[PDB]
Nucleic acid binder design. Sequence first.
RNA 1: UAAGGGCAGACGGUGGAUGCCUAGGCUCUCGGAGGCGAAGAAGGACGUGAUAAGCUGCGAAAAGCUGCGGGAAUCGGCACAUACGAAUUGAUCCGCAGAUAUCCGAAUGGGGCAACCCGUCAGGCCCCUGACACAUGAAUUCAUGAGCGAACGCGGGGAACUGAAACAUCUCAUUACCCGUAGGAGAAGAAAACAAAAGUGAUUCCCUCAGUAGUGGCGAGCGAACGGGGAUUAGCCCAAACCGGCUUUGUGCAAAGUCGGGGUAAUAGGACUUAGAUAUAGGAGAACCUACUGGAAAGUAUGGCCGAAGAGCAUGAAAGCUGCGUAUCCGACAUAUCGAGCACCUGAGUAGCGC
RNA 2: AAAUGUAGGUAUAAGUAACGAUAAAGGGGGCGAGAACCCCCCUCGCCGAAAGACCAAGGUUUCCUGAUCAACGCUAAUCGGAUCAGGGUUAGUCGGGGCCUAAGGAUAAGCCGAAUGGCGAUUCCGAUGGAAGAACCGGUUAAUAUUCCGGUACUGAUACUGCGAUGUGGUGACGGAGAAGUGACAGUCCGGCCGUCUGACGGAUAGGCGGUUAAAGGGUGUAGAUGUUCGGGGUAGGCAAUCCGCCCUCAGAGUGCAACCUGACAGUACGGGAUAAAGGACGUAACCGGCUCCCAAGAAAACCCGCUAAGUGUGUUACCCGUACCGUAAACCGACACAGGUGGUUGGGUUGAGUAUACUAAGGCG
Lengths: 92, 63
Amino acid sequence: GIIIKPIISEKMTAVTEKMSERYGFRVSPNANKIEIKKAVEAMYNVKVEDVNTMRYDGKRKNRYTSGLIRGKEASFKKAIVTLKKGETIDFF
Amino acid sequence: MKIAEIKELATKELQERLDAEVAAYDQMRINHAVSPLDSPAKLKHQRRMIAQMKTVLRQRELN
RNA sequence: UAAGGGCAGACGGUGGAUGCCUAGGCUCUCGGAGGCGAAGAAGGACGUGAUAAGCUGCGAAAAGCUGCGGGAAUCGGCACAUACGAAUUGAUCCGCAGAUAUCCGAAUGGGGCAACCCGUCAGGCCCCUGACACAUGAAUUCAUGAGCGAACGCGGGGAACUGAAACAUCUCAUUACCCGUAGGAGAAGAAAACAAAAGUGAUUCCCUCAGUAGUGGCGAGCGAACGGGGAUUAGCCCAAACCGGCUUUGUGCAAAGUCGGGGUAAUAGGACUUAGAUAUAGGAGAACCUACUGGAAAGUAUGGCCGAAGAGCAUGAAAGCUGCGUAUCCGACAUAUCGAGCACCUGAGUAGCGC
RNA sequence: AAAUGUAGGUAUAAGUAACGAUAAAGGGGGCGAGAACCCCCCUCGCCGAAAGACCAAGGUUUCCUGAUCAACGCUAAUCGGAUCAGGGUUAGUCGGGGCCUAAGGAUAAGCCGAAUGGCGAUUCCGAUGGAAGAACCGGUUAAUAUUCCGGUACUGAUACUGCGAUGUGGUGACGGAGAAGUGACAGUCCGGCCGUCUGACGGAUAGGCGGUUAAAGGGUGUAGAUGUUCGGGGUAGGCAAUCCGCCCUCAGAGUGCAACCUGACAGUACGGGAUAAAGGACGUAACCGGCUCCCAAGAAAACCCGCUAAGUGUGUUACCCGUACCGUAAACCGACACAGGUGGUUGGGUUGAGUAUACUAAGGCG
Ligand SMILES: [K+]
Ligand SMILES: [K+]
Ligand SMILES: [K+]
Ligand SMILES: [K+]
Ligand SMILES: [Mg+2]
Ligand SMILES: [Mg+2]
Ligand SMILES: [Mg+2]
Ligand SMILES: [Mg+2]
Ligand SMILES: [Mg+2]
Ligand SMILES: [Mg+2]
Ligand SMILES: [Mg+2]
Ligand SMILES: [Mg+2]
Ligand SMILES: [Mg+2]
Ligand SMILES: [Mg+2]
Ligand SMILES: [Mg+2]
Ligand SMILES: [Mg+2]
Ligand SMILES: [Mg+2]
Ligand SMILES: [Mg+2]
Ligand SMILES: [Mg+2]
Ligand SMILES: [Mg+2]
Ligand SMILES: [Mg+2]
Ligand SMILES: [Mg+2]
Ligand SMILES: [Mg+2]
Ligand SMILES: [Mg+2]
Ligand SMILES: [Mg+2]
Ligand SMILES: [Mg+2]
Ligand SMILES: [Mg+2]
Ligand SMILES: [Mg+2]
Ligand SMILES: [Mg+2]
Ligand SMILES: [Mg+2]
Ligand SMILES: [Mg+2]
Ligand SMILES: [Mg+2]
Ligand SMILES: [Mg+2]
Ligand code: NA
Ligand code: NA
Ligand code: NA
Ligand code: NA
């Protein structure tokens, strides 16, 4: 369960519009770069050339009741994947 | 599927269906995030079926 | 007269008292039980949903997976809305047995600022990633232990304030507190005992004896036992004399050690001469109508009926006959529990003694 | 009904004190129900060895964008470090970590001690220090940038084209002060080249304005500096201390200067072009882990090199964590959007001995 979801954001759509081989996924926070290249290539059947990663802690969501009921979203890791020049991926 | 039909499968084939079920389950979760599916209830059903195959395959070895 | 002010009343504001109520407390009685953990605990971290902050449940098989018994139309937790599904081929739900069970933590491969970093070894994939093992200490590879946690027990240490109307002996007190370590209880326990010519015979606990005999800067204080009445009741095993074997040692003998036989005293004695029941799910379980008031009868007034059931809670007010129940009876695939003589022996740095 | 008695609520002083540095504001437009305060523009004013820029500690989403003005903001507010939602942090080389050791800590064998425990190596841990593995300039987003893109570099592994440690050596390896000579960058002035404009009033087709750029890496061995000097230890060895034959520092270290360089910034014109947009004079320790003097006499271990004992070419590839934003502060320590405190680096011009002082640019503020 490495890949959680692809990234469809304003920044990433522009990045793909310039580099057609550049895509971004959300992955399990404890997966390393070698594993991620294996997963994107064993599921989309492509040639991954480069992977960059960043770790996001979750946003705190502190509500109030009788005060300070802390909450937090789960942490995630972002992987920016570069394919072999000339290959694409279709999220539909 | 259903629990009765899963046990009917042989040991060699059950592992073949298992990897197929795990593979198709990751695509659906990715598909659901890109755009919600027609039947969201198939996510729970697929996930809880995978637990059924792991249970029966364990029973064959353990017992 | 009234810029303004005073008093009374009427109606409001604010605030949250009071009355009524309960979802939570408090003190106990009866029965059971008194642990969990290296097969990884207590307690946590991080995750887990169509949707998902927080709790709850669960653990990458992640509001859950598989059987067996129960039960019968709803169900996908608190908990809504929306959305999609499950289920009379028996879903959800309950009892029992299994499967899975990340990271930290005794934490145990080495380190470490808990929830992280770094290895050796054997296997299989491919810079990486799976799945094994690898601490220490006390016994003989194997077996064991460690840590946590109510009170009650037994041990090792051990205050002061206070009282003495000051204070040092004394008191508070062999308390508070700290540490070690058991069990369902523990400790004690079968006379080298009490008694006073009269007797009772292990230990423990209750009522008396008794605020007595004593003790004490004879101050403040401290404080028995005998005897009597109860609860409960229970008694046993070694060592030694001596005999036999075997090993060892010194030189056939003798000594030691080790197993077998002998033997266990106070009137002295000894040697020799159970399978059914219960527990953890369940099944059945009687009997009411009309009128009035009322938003609503269960109220009130008639007239019925049930009762081994007139305990209760809920229902639009206060219900034996509306519902869940109650009295009573009937039920378990699992698992859990229930002779003369003789002088040979009878525990040693012990009894006793000085400081 | 009273204990300077306790909780909750509401009064009085009172529409009073005060609204937190006397750096300062004025006008025109805009959105809007609503404007002293919000946005844009013109003018004015303050800081400028800072009140500008870059890190560390600490904080932990405050960062950007849309919606909102109940509460918060000492006023109002269409605004905000406020509420809600969405988005945003990209590394073979940077900073850590992986390696090494200091103070100290935990221990082994042992020692001590009613218990709990106290000590105790050359062992391990532990940076604020040492590493023989290595990158710098520019540009792009609303929000990241030695990380993405461009250009130009470097460092390990890996595949195809006799070795020598656990012992023991060498290295690593270290103070303070002082000035000088040589000479870059920055900066200033002079003078060409490129583009652009002709500025209230008297004068000027001669002037105003913006430019004319550069690092790591590579080369040279230049200024300058240092060197003409058979017993004591590390290499031919047995578990560092009574020997003998053998190759040297005669060259090392090193600015400046070539090259990297037909990149880049600003302004005009329309990704491309002018644009391959001369040069000087000063100034100038960044050579220097150097030189000279002095006494108070200036870490350790590992990396990297020895010794014996025991036994070039190409390609592929480089894992982990940090990276937003604040940071002489409204975001850290002070109960506060508090006149206090908070380590390191940079810090233009004129004036000056100066990093003092005064005025100003960039940038930031009223
Ligand atoms: K460990
Ligand atoms: K014996
Ligand atoms: K806005
Ligand atoms: K140029
Ligand atoms: Mg890259
Ligand atoms: Mg990174
Ligand atoms: Mg009133
Ligand atoms: Mg009340
Ligand atoms: Mg069933
Ligand atoms: Mg006294
Ligand atoms: Mg026990
Ligand atoms: Mg007992
Ligand atoms: Mg007073
Ligand atoms: Mg006054
Ligand atoms: Mg006044
Ligand atoms: Mg004040
Ligand atoms: Mg005033
Ligand atoms: Mg002010
Ligand atoms: Mg500043
Ligand atoms: Mg902001
Ligand atoms: Mg306001
Ligand atoms: Mg905001
Ligand atoms: Mg580095
Ligand atoms: Mg070390
Ligand atoms: Mg920024
Ligand atoms: Mg850059
Ligand atoms: Mg070492
Ligand atoms: Mg930054
Ligand atoms: Mg302020
Ligand atoms: Mg200071
Ligand atoms: Mg400086
Ligand atoms: Mg200056
Ligand atoms: Mg000054
Ligand atoms: Na009047
Ligand atoms: Na698994
Ligand atoms: Na029933
Ligand atoms: Na050079």
